[PDB]
């Protein structure tokens, strides 16, 4: 059978930053859920839509795997109805969320002595994002009433900053890889779901 490319999305050597997050859609195939426990360092296997009793018997038209990397103590913000920088300017979750989120520590990989400035995140925006929205513009955020015609300075800043990940950080200040599996049942009669025992 054709299996979900789980290990290709759950083991990507380089993940995406949070504001420009990666989204990979999985098409019709077999959905082997109870195989992701291979490594299992994990941090939070909570699920909102489907509780841990319908792991493979239920089906969905298509699933989206969203991948990115955040700091530790912000994983709590990844939930429908949360507030905070990550919950407003980098990722939003709808209150009717049917998939669920997964996270794990990755300190040994994404942290380098001297700072790993490749990961960034947005801390300035004119208004909150929309569920599953994505923004990549780098326009100079205006704070004051004087237009800055695109140059950093007073009352207008570059709306991006970067985690300086290092190994000598406490938990909650260490890199954490996050994957969101959002399900979808629009109208498809036959689609991707779990295998049956023969």
């Amino acid at each position: 059978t054709n299996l979900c490319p789980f290990d290709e999305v759950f083991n990507a050597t380089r993940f995406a930053s949070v504001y420009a997050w990666n989204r990979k859609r999985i098409s019709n195939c077999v959905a082997d859920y109870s195989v992701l426990y291979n490594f299992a360092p994990f941090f939070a296997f909570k699920c909102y839509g489907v509780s841990p009793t319908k792991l493979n018997d239920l089906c969905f038209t298509n699933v989206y795997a969203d991948s990115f990397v955040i700091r530790g103590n912000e994983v709590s913000q990844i939930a429908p109805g949360q507030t905070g920088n990550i919950a407003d300017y980098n990722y939003k979750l709808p209150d009717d969320f049917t998939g669920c989120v997964i996270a794990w520590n990755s300190n040994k990989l994404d942290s380098k002595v001297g700072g790993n400035y490749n990961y960034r995140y947005r801390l300035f925006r004119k208004s909150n994002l929309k569920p599953f929205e994505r923004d990549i513009s780098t326009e100079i955020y205006q704070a004051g009433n004087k237009p800055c015609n695109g140059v950093a300075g007073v009352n207008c800043y570059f709306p991006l900053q970067s985690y300086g990940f290092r190994p000598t950080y406490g938990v909650g200040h260490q890199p954490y890889r996050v994957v969101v599996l959002s399900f979808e049942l629009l109208h498809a009669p036959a689609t991707v779901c779990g295998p049956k025992k023969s």
Partner: protein
Amino acid sequence: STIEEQAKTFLDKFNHEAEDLFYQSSLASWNYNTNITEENVQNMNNAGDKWSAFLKEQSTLAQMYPLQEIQNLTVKLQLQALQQNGSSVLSEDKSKRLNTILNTMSTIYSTGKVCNPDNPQECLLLEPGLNEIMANSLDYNERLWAWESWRSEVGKQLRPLYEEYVVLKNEMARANHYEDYGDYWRGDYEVNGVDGYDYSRGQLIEDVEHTFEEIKPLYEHLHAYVRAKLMNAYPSYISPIGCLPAHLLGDMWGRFWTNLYSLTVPFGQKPNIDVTDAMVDQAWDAQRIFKEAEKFFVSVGLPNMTQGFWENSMLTDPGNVQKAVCHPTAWDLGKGDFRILMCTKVTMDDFLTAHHEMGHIQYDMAYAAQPFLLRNGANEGFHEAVGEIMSLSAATPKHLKSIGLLSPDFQEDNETEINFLLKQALTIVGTLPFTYMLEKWRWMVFKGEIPKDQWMKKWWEMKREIVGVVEPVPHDETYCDPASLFHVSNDYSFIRYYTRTLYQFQFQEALCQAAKHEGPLHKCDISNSTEAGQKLFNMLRLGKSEPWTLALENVVG
């Protein structure tokens, strides 16, 4: 978007920048302190000026949000901490002139030498060798030679520099609307606009002078007892109704009387508690010490150590060649990285210094969720007070025998009680009249109430009146005796040692009630009591967010 939102966004940018720059600076400084090389000094200075320039430019950039239009207390506090000009409000000539005399005074103090009148090729420094004569000897003439020569050969160089330093500091303080330097210093206890917890900068003087009026009844009896006990070690030199000669007090200035203990122990034949033997006998190590400290702390309800603390911390002295500054401190680099730097040795003293340091760390782990500019004790006196009550409680026999370092019975007696309380009072109480006196002199010198031809006259009048000691040799207006002290010549505020002594006991009393203690106060022990931990945490976790008069009320009442 009027004024407040822009201020908030600016503060967010600052919080996210300075948090990283400070981490880099502090990490460089730690690496230098723990492994002394040459290039380490270069990296340290690079990170240092990198951070300092950023702070200065942010200061200049923040002087545009007027303080009168902000309404939130938090952002107002941050902006006020950030806006202060500090120095650099002077001219460039003047600022360079000031930075020169500061270093000159510090260097004179650090490398001054005096030498014998008979073998002038035997010059002694202060640190390893003068305050050893003053601390160990019993020869009246030797102590007198040391006390007099240190002031006559080094104090006489600091006078023309201190007279010039006073003026520059007063100008720098007046340019910021403060009326003098002393007010600039007292400006740390000031609280404005909370409607019930205010505190003027002039009220501190009345509080200090009123709290000191109730200690004289006890200081007088302690002074009389010590004077009577000295008329047997230096007969014919002490008058039974006069003051004490200033050179017989235990150290070069008289800041602590703790060296007169050997001469004035009440019951000399009762050796006080010590477990230095039973620790090496049960084969204890640094790891055991700090595990016991962490256990005592978690016992009251405070969290564990962050487990990164065990790996990065330098608990034992690196052996071969890793030259390190052995002075026990706690480091709060930030972002969740707390460390300890101390060169432990299995002893009883290190068993208490461990508790002191871990108290500091437990304080820092509490307010770590605050904005970067609000990570500090409620004022300058809270930090060491919180650190001190831990070692205060972790030295009681009731705690030691519970650990196991004592015999399971160890019947105590009311003679070791006195032997202990006296050794305490020579350090705690013996230093309160000195402190309050010194800081009263400086406050009057900066203000102008003492014309500069009467500095020594007022100094030695206040010494005889308040502290109760007399000088053994007259001193005209060419000397400068206060400048021969570390804090005076290096420009450090000295009142934080007065108030810290007071709070340290208020806390100890309040917590003692939450643990439901019965007997004397000096046997209190807060271990195994969670309500004490809660009362303490509800003040620890504030930082500078609230006025210190509120945090103090959260515990004492």
